[PDB]
């Protein structure tokens with residue numbers, strides 16, 4: 001079957017035929033930034049394997065005005081082809097008047113043209129405010145995973161790699177960047193210019209990139225030669241200094257660690273005004289949101305720095321993981337993304353150990369654990385089809401779990417061995433693709449008895465959920481039962497490595513596992529044991545017997561006798577099992593007593609995080625009695641440390657993080673003093689007409705405070721537009737979402753639609769923010785529900801944007817009622833809407849909420865009332 005206008009389609013599967021193999025693209029693009037469109041011409045050197053009468057490749061909203069196939073041997077320049085367009089598979093078929101012949105190299109060549117894109121996809125238009133207040137346009141690309149086909153027709157699968165020779169034509173007011181460095185620039189008749197770029201190494205289509213803009217740069221050189229350059233609005237070249245330092249340090253590290261030089265002469269990182277993802281790893285031309293790449297010590301904070309450091313790291317890691325060695329297909333996307341999410345950890349701890357990213361990392365896992373503890377979860381490695389499924393593939397599973405199980409795996413195998421493991425892997429696939437299994441093999445092979453590692457990871461990657469490992473203590477024999485962990489199954493088995501210490505020697509007893517059930521003996525009767533040291537393992541431990549109580553009392557006596565990640569980890573599981581139903585809320589709440597002794601901010605903050613979480617539940621629902629005693633228990637306890645915090649920016653990262661943490665908790669809870677001081681700094685800053693410097697750490701706090709008066713709110717929105725700091729704007733906007741006036745917030749949400757004052761790219765994040773506040777949880781839900789039509793014009797489902805606009809506004813619900821209006825909306829979404837897996841997840845989550853409450857709510861009230869006495 002087929003289309004468009006009559007005539008039939010030679011190929012009826014959404015994948016492409018292996019027959020016609022692409023070897024090289026010649027790619028010319030003539031964009032116009034006034035006309036706001038482009039004209040283009042390409043020339044693909046094919047290579048048939050089996051003779052055939054028709055050629056098949058991808059194309060999308062591309063008008064093709066000339067199709068030929070020249071011969072190199074058959075025929076002299078050059079026969080014309082018949083173009084068949086099948087949209088519902090975003091394919092076009094070429095028609096030859098003469099079947100081709102195996103083992104022969106041809107040249108398919110077409111002329112095409114389109115308008116510059118609307119969205120955040122393909123070859124699209126973006127703008128930005130100068131310091132003068134001028135709006136300015138530029139042209140940029142985003143091809144992952146299925147969008148190179150909207151830019152130039154091609155074989156848009158990650159497996160069909162090729163060389164790419166791009167030529168860009170431009171006004172003299174602009175510059176052109178692309179993956180490779182610029183060979184030359186010729187002038188043209190009318191004073192037009194044409195840039196020629198080094199031919200790329202073999203590489204997938206989704207990684208091709210080109211850009212026209214009038215940006216400025218800071219350049220530098222990695223010790224191994226490469227010219228790193230940070231590109232941004234000319235008014236912003238200052239914020240690009242950190243980006244440069246770190247890129248440099250990082251590329252240096254990577255080359256050494258991976259023991260593979262980065263192939264290209266140059267590496268550019270550019271800060272795109274309008275950019276949907278946080279960044280795109282385009283080889284030699286990595287795009288970023290300004291908030292991922294730009295840093296301004298006046299406005300950028302502890303966390304900020306850490307995060308931009310983080311995404312720069314993550315993106316440079318891609319130059320190897322993904323770029324050099326590309327997964328064969330979007331099912332094992334995780335291979336690219338989990339390994340990159342992981343290498344984050346390594347390289348930053350490596351180069352910037354002061355950022356102390358390690359103590360953080362776990363959160364990456366804790367958070368995936370939250371989503372993996374549902375039935376609506378999935379296997380890191382899964383079948384993928386429609387472009388939409390592919391997009392759905394980009395999530396916490398592929399990213400975080402992937403990064404976590406790898407980390408676990410590195411524990412079982414050790415750095416030096418794991419490092420070797422990857423060096424090999426990379427080199428064995430340089431400039432090509434690799435399969436899920438391919439990786440395991442290259443790792444597990446780093447006598448004469450065998451590293452069976454495969455089995456282990458193979459269960460991890462290919463099935464849902466996360467293991468719960470209950471342990472029973474009877475003198476010197478410990479019962480081990482492994483279950484699928486869920487949050488209130490049958491058929492899951494994990495080769496889950498175990499770890500554990502005892503109250504005795506602080507030494508790490510290891511021991512694998514691969515059966516539904518096993519047992520182990522303890523060399524000496526001991527107080528307590530703690531399985532999964534440092535929490536380096538992707539699983540949970542439940543302590544039946546006095547196992548739980550023993551650990552908790554240990555925490556109140558001499559807690560330092562516990563690893564600070566054990567502490568952290570413990571806190572985590574305790575509260576999770578309370579949701580599992582296996583524990584009762586009082587036990588967890590009781591752990592939170594030792595927190596007055598806890599100096600590991602990691603733990604101190606995690607504990608606090610949960611207490612904080614409960615107050616917020618109570619607050620949304622009207623539950624005034626609990627939320628107010630919780631506020632009180634929070635102010636009173638912790639008032640020691642709360643009152644120890646300086647409205648400054650001194651101390652280590654965690655010291656700063658802790659400061660902002662607490663001081664927020666304080667102002668959020670209305671601690672008169674703090675909320676007065678904050679009030680002060682703002683009125684000062686505002687009336688000093690911006691001259692006064694609020695410390696970046698308390699920055700959000702002050703802004704969010706000053707936003708309570710319509711006087712301040714109106715100054716901040718005014719202040720927002722003029723700002724040159726992506727980072728400051730972020731914080732202003734946040735502070736804007738802390739108003740209590742419906743229309744005020746409503747305004748924001750609408751300005752997000754508009755997308756002229758507040759870029760649409762923020763629409764999700766913003767919505768999410770408002771839905772959080774009790775005031776706006778309704779507004780938001782209303783809006784999304786009402787505007788799902790126009791929303792879907794602006795974004796794709798399932799774009800991460802749409803995906804999070806959905807959950808962000810609903811995932812926090814906890815009533816039977818809300819759970820229907822959602823359930824119902826998801827039914828409604830069921831023309832073009834249905835279906836996103838997030839539809840399930842969202843519900844599974846709202847049920848878990850109602851449950852957790854009806855289950856554990858009464859327990860909360862008494863537990864608190866108890867303290868009051």
Ligand SMILES: *[C@@H]1O[C@H](CO)[C@@H](O[C@@H]2O[C@H](CO)[C@@H](O)[C@H](O)[C@H]2NC(C)=O)[C@H](O)[C@H]1NC(C)=O
Nearest residue numbers: 030031032033034035169170171172190192193
């Ligand atoms: C895109 O088209 C624009 C129209 O805005 C081009 O500019 C006109 O081009 C002709 C030939 O260069 C000139 O005679 C006019 O003076 C231009 N008008 C303006 C307002 O500049 C522009 O060259 C194109 N952009 C590119 C370089 O591709």
Ligand SMILES: *[C@@H]1O[C@H](CO)[C@@H](O[C@@H]2O[C@H](CO)[C@@H](O)[C@H](O)[C@H]2NC(C)=O)[C@H](O)[C@H]1NC(C)=O
Nearest residue numbers: 023024162163164199200201202203430431432
């Ligand atoms: C297309 O890309 C390849 C690399 O993917 C270019 O280079 C060859 O790559 C191998 C493998 O790393 C190197 O060892 C060789 O030095 C390169 N060979 C050559 C030709 O020098 C290759 O040159 C590119 N081909 C085109 C069409 O330019």
Ligand SMILES: *[C@@H]1O[C@H](CO)[C@@H](O)[C@H](O)[C@H]1NC(C)=O
Nearest residue numbers: 017018019049050051052102
């Ligand atoms: C191409 O040829 C190979 C070997 O001759 C064969 O395995 C394959 O089926 C052919 N492709 C098709 C489906 O025509």
Ligand SMILES: *[C@@H]1O[C@H](CO)[C@@H](O)[C@H](O)[C@H]1NC(C)=O
Nearest residue numbers: 345346349350351353358415
């Ligand atoms: C982090 O780096 C330090 C040295 O810089 C090292 O001791 C530690 O092993 C690293 N953490 C891991 C396991 O990556």
Ligand SMILES: *[C@@H]1O[C@H](CO)[C@@H](O)[C@H](O)[C@H]1NC(C)=O
Nearest residue numbers: 554556557558559560561562
């Ligand atoms: C636990 O507490 C004691 C006294 O309260 C303290 O001096 C001791 O150093 C702590 N134990 C350890 C090993 O830190």
Ligand SMILES: N[C@@H](CCCC[NH3+])C(=O)O
Nearest residue numbers: 142144277278279280281
């Ligand atoms: N690969 C990108 C995500 C971009 C996906 C959408 N273009 C990253 O590392 O975050």
Ligand SMILES: [Zn+2]
Nearest residue numbers: 318336337340
């Ligand atoms: Zn990535």
